[PDB]
Amino acid sequence: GKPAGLNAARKLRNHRREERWADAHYKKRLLGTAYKSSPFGGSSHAKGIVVEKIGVEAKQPNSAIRKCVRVQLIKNGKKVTAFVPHDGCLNFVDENDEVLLSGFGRKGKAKGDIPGVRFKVVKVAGVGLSALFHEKKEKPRA
Amino acid sequence: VRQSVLADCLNNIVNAERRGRRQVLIRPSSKVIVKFLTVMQKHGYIDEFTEIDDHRSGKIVIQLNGRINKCGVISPRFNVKLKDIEKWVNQLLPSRQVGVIVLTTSRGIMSHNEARAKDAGGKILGFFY
Amino acid sequence: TQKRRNNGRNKHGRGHVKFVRCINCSRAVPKDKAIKRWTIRNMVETAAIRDLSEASVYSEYTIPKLYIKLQYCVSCAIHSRVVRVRSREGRRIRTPP
Amino acid sequence: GRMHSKGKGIASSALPYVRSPPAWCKADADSVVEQILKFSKKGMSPSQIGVTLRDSHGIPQVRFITGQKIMRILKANGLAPELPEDLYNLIKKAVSVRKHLERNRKDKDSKFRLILIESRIHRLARYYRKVGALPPTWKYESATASALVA
RNA sequence: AAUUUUCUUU
RNA sequence: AAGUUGGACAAACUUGGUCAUUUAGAGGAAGUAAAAGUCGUAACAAGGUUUCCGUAGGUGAACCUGCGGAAGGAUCAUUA
RNA sequence: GGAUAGUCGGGGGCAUUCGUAUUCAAUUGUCAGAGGUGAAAUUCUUGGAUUUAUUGAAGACGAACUACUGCGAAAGCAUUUGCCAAGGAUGUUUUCAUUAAUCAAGAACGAAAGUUAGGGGAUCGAAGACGAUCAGAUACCGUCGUAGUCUUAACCAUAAACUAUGCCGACUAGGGAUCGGGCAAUGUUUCUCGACUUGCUCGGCACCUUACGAGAAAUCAAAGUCUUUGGGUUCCGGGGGGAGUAUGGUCGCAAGGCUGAAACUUAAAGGAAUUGACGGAAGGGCACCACAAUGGAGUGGAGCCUGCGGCUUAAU
RNA sequence: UUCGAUGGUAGGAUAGAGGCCUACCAUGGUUUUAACGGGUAACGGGGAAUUAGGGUUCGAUUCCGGAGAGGGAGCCUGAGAAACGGCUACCACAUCCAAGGAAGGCAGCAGGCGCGCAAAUUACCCAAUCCCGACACGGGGAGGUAGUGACAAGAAAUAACAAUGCAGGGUCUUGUAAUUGGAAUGAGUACAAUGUAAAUACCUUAACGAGGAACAAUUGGAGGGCAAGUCUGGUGCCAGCAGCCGCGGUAAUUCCAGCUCCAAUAGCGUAUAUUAAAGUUGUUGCAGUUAAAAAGCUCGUAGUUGAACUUUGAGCCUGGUCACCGGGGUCGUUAACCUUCUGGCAAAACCAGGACUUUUACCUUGAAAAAAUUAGAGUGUUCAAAGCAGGCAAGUUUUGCUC
Ligand SMILES: [Zn+2]
């Protein structure tokens, strides 16, 4: 079973220290992967430039076009994939719009049927989504 | 090999009590076992026990009367201060009124309540209720 | 799950047992796992006793027999119907019917 | 629980409750002490001393009449072997196994048994050096084990 | 002896 | 004072070995995901050669075979 | 722990003895098939195949006895005898006196297969060669057949290496078999012992019923004595792929062994059990919308009535 | 361990011990109880978040200690600096040059550029706290005050008294009001007193200041989780919604438009980090036959764990909160403060005071111990986040008392 001696504190502490690496949560914190190879170095949001738009296909059992775009980060140089939440915004969003990218809400995991996408766009041209949609704000003449 | 004799004694006693037998034979015996049993006797959970004095560790025959649920040992012998008695009672005893925790206090083997009265901590031996 | 407590063979207190050859398919089946039967057959059929007696010598000699030990594998025994698949309750019996 | 085996035998001798000299005996204490000394000069181990005295001469336990163990008697009267009997027997067994192995190198079972005996000898030697029965620089070498026995 | 295959749903 | 001779601390530069991290490259071999491809059917029933493990060989492929093991088998069973 | 007495063991090693079977070789007897398979087919046989009979050689293996039986730490160990070392249990009013349990690091053994040199190569048999089955058989089937299967001196070091269940210690329900030892019988039997019978006890291999108890259940006398959670001590896991992969280190002639990730992807993977369905699984039976019966009448083969596809047209 | 790594001698240097340095003599010191090396997106602590307990995470940052003033190195002054709002040289930058040269360092207070998801005025004042100096008199971007915000905590605008018929209820009371009307109205508007260095603000001041755009409450959701529609229209596996399951192929309670409802409230959602749940890190307190998991087996040293046994019980005195309990001394079982020093008695021996654990671990108490912070005692910031004050005292106004 487990050691139960009064002088086995070192043995118990060492075994717990070795075994805690098997924990998925502890490993993801102690490896530093957020600052080592992750697209986001712990940042909640990051600015980027739109590269292109990709029509990803939904997985089973759904079937639709996800209306995604590809965005190149300006502070890291890593090319990632972005998801536009609403409908009819890919026409408004053109190349080089200075978009803002954030997480999806699954702690960096793909949400729903969208394959291989982990980020979502929040602002376009520095004005914010759902503002130009309701015709409250307008895209600057850039 | 045998590590603690109190644990074997308490395991045999609780096994006999669960089985419903009115007597149990305990071997080996020791001073710690004797002090534990007299504490249980003065609290009323265990009836008379006869210590068979051999030219060895010695045996003992214990008369049971039910009315106990489980008597166990706490290994290793953790050091229990006065402030930790309440935590141990909440951790091990069924309630604040029913249940006895035995400590090998420097004054002697005694229940947790009278150890509190004497205002002296020690090392935890076991419990019974 | 364990279908059988003995794991299908009589191996208690052993580490290895020799393997025998099935008569039909010549498969290697362990000695404690092979189904054993003893064919004790008269050297002639019971329908030829009169013909043998009328064509024999030695004033009513004793007709010999043949003793053959047959060791089947699991698949061959099931196909030959010497051993049959039984219910779960009936699996726990060993006395021959 | 055998130290180097899986056996769980409990065979032993159960000494009587009466830790007294025999009620019907004429051992005379000192006569038995000189008798043990005579047998020690004859050259038999203390186990053989007790076995012969119990089986033939009729004294059940020597310490009951003498007041001390026979090893204590031998040490007091000076006939104390340098090597303890149990260690001497273990080393003699190891020598016999080593001789068997050197004449027959293919006995892997004997090699395994020699490893067990070597471990037992070292553990016993460590105990004896710790208690003080042997010099602290006792050590155990297979080359000189034959000379140690003889 | 010999017997391969059953698209994504309602 | 200007100036002179030695000593210690000693920034900094060229080179060589070592450590840590980051970053191109002609080319090569992998995994990872598919609304309705091509080849055939290995496994799940005795899956139609019972299955699996270790090892070795071979073949377009699932895979086949040799040797030794296991039932997680399709037998808890022939006392005569 | 050690000693001692009678034992016990298919425990180890060495030397030695015996058994039939397989293949082959020589010789003798008549002749037409022999092998093999569902069917065959390859192959060899009036030059004597196959069979029968005598003798010999080679290598492998110890059938039956052989078991819910034994031994060993495990892998494993099955012909006779002798020798050597060692081992468990039992008996003991024998000896020592805590000498003990479990382990990192480090070491011994480690099936089978695989490697390097020597010997030997009967049988089987990876690779392979043909010959049948099939649409394709590259496989399963038949014959031959190299490495291998045997052994010595060096290697490695893993298997479903399993009881998928670490080791030591205490307690816990009823019974009957079996092995080894011991105790008891004014017990039985056979020319002082053995065999058999009964009871008791210790240590093993297991078994039946049951569940005070446990588990998710299958089930378990331990997998019980755990929410009433603590006898002691090692190994090992933190959802599924990636992946026992990459890299690094280490051992190995090599094959490979040990240690052993990360990025990314995913909402499942998995275990036990239940009800249906299915089975080229089994056992009981039912059926001219099933078969047998030399079945009877027939249809399809001919020409026409009529219906359905296809063609055409304007709708057909 | 070369070029000081471990120790001895002697010397040098330092304010001072010291391999800090030098000459000689020995090979020593640490380490599986993890030495050494590497990483740290690591200044450390008081402390903060979650809270059965145990724990986990964070702590640049109002207090303490350390380091730095672009990276090093050296040095003067001074008691005190290896000081940078002191100096010197190199390295990387910026600047006027007449081309000879000169000259610096805001990780200080403001402000600018760039990196950025991410963070404020080129303001006033030494009045309060304190510091410096020759010193009542001077200075202090330390410090106090204010301008700016969506957020850090505490209090609360968007109302409300009746006539009215219907649904009513049981002669007393709620609601839909295309209705009225006189009421209390505060946000603001102005002014006065107070406040303050000057102010702003708070408090406070008469007085102007709603009849409906009055001076329009928002944020999400309305299938389960989890609370609130199978309502009406548009599309038809398309747009899309959607934290997971999941909805959508012409009846869409889950897509977008309207109506209404549900939750919080001047706040709500989203993205990320972390905590509880996670008994999925399990010492408390996991699991290993079949879900992931017992090394093929054995020996063996660190490590962990280690049978029993060495003075137990009975009877008193006295004083302590309730037939009860804790505490000090004794005599006999068996000798009852072992032993030492000092002082006394004296045939060795006895009494009193001090020391008294062989040696710990363990438990109890005390000492010295930073504050804030945590709990918490007292106390009319109108309550509260607060703060450490405050109170007496209406009938004299007493140049006091009390905490
Ligand atoms: Zn067969």
Swiss-Prot record, chain A:
Location relative to the cell: Cytoplasm; Nucleus; Nucleus, Nucleolus
Keywords assigned by UniProt, alphabetized: Cytoplasm, Hydroxylation, Nucleus, Ribonucleoprotein, Ribosomal protein
Single biological process term from Gene Ontology: cytoplasmic translation
Nucleus recorded as keyword: yes
Alphabetized GO MF terms: structural constituent of ribosome
Protein family (similarity comment): Belongs to the universal ribosomal protein uS12 family.
PANTHER family, A to Z: 30S RIBOSOMAL PROTEIN S12 FAMILY MEMBER
Other remarks on this protein: There are 2 genes for uS12 in S.pombe.
The protein's name: Small ribosomal subunit protein uS12A
Gene giving rise to this polypeptide: rps23
Curated annotation (Swiss-Prot), chain B:
Keyword Ubl conjugation attached: no
Subcellular location: Cytoplasm; Nucleus
GO biological process: cytoplasmic translation
Gene Ontology MF annotations: structural constituent of ribosome
InterPro entries: Ribosomal_uS8, Ribosomal_uS8_CS, Ribosomal_uS8_sf
Keyword Protease in annotation: no
UniProt signal peptide: none
Pfam families tied to this protein: Ribosomal_S8
Entry keywords, A to Z: Cytoplasm, Nucleus, Ribonucleoprotein, Ribosomal protein
Domain of life: Eukaryota
Record-level GO cellular component terms: cytoplasmic stress granule; cytosol; cytosolic small ribosomal subunit; nucleus
Homology family: Belongs to the universal ribosomal protein uS8 family.
Family matches, as PANTHER family: 40S RIBOSOMAL PROTEIN S15A
Purpose: Component of the ribosome, a large ribonucleoprotein complex responsible for the synthesis of proteins in the cell. The small ribosomal subunit (SSU) binds messenger RNAs (mRNAs) and translates the encoded message by selecting cognate aminoacyl-transfer RNA (tRNA) molecules. The large subunit (LSU) contains the ribosomal catalytic site termed the peptidyl transferase center (PTC), which catalyzes the formation of peptide bonds, thereby polymerizing the amino acids delivered by tRNAs into a polypeptide chain.
Oligomeric and partner information: Component of the small ribosomal subunit (SSU). Mature yeast ribosomes consist of a small (40S) and a large (60S) subunit. The 40S small subunit contains 1 molecule of ribosomal RNA (18S rRNA) and at least 33 different proteins. The large 60S subunit contains 3 rRNA molecules (25S, 5.8S and 5S rRNA) and at least 46 different proteins.
Curated annotation (Swiss-Prot), chain C:
Cell location: Cytoplasm
UniProt KW keywords: Cytoplasm, Ribonucleoprotein, Ribosomal protein
GO terms classed as biological process: cytoplasmic translation; ribosome biogenesis
GO CC annotation terms, alphabetical: cytosol; cytosolic small ribosomal subunit
Top-level lineage group: Eukaryota
Main location: cytoplasm
Gene Ontology MF, one: structural constituent of ribosome
Assembly and interaction partners: Component of the small ribosomal subunit (SSU). Mature yeast ribosomes consist of a small (40S) and a large (60S) subunit. The 40S small subunit contains 1 molecule of ribosomal RNA (18S rRNA) and at least 33 different proteins. The large 60S subunit contains 3 rRNA molecules (25S, 5.8S and 5S rRNA) and at least 46 different proteins. eS26 interacts with eS1 forming part of the mRNA exit tunnel. eS26 interacts with TSR2.
Family according to the record: Belongs to the eukaryotic ribosomal protein eS26 family.
Role noted for this protein: Component of the ribosome, a large ribonucleoprotein complex responsible for the synthesis of proteins in the cell. The small ribosomal subunit (SSU) binds messenger RNAs (mRNAs) and translates the encoded message by selecting cognate aminoacyl-transfer RNA (tRNA) molecules. The large subunit (LSU) contains the ribosomal catalytic site termed the peptidyl transferase center (PTC), which catalyzes the formation of peptide bonds, thereby polymerizing the amino acids delivered by tRNAs into a polypeptide chain.
Additional free-text comment from the UniProt record: There are 2 genes for eS26 in S.pombe.
Part of the intact protein present: 2 to 98 of 119
From Swiss-Prot, chain D:
GO biological process: cytoplasmic translation
UniProt keyword Cytoplasm, yes or no: yes
Keywords from the named record: Cytoplasm, Phosphoprotein, Ribonucleoprotein, Ribosomal protein
Positions where Phosphoserine occurs in the chain: S20, S31
GO molecular function: small ribosomal subunit rRNA binding; structural constituent of ribosome
InterPro entries the UniProt entry points to: Ribosomal_uS15, Ribosomal_uS15_arc_euk, Ribosomal_uS15_N, uS15_NS1_RNA-bd_sf
Protein location: Cytoplasm
Assigned GO CC terms: cytosol; cytosolic small ribosomal subunit; nucleolus
N-terminal signal peptide: none
Family named by the database record: Belongs to the universal ribosomal protein uS15 family.
Reported function: Component of the ribosome, a large ribonucleoprotein complex responsible for the synthesis of proteins in the cell. The small ribosomal subunit (SSU) binds messenger RNAs (mRNAs) and translates the encoded message by selecting cognate aminoacyl-transfer RNA (tRNA) molecules. The large subunit (LSU) contains the ribosomal catalytic site termed the peptidyl transferase center (PTC), which catalyzes the formation of peptide bonds, thereby polymerizing the amino acids delivered by tRNAs into a polypeptide chain.
Subunit structure: Component of the small ribosomal subunit (SSU). Mature yeast ribosomes consist of a small (40S) and a large (60S) subunit. The 40S small subunit contains 1 molecule of ribosomal RNA (18S rRNA) and at least 33 different proteins. The large 60S subunit contains 3 rRNA molecules (25S, 5.8S and 5S rRNA) and at least 46 different proteins.
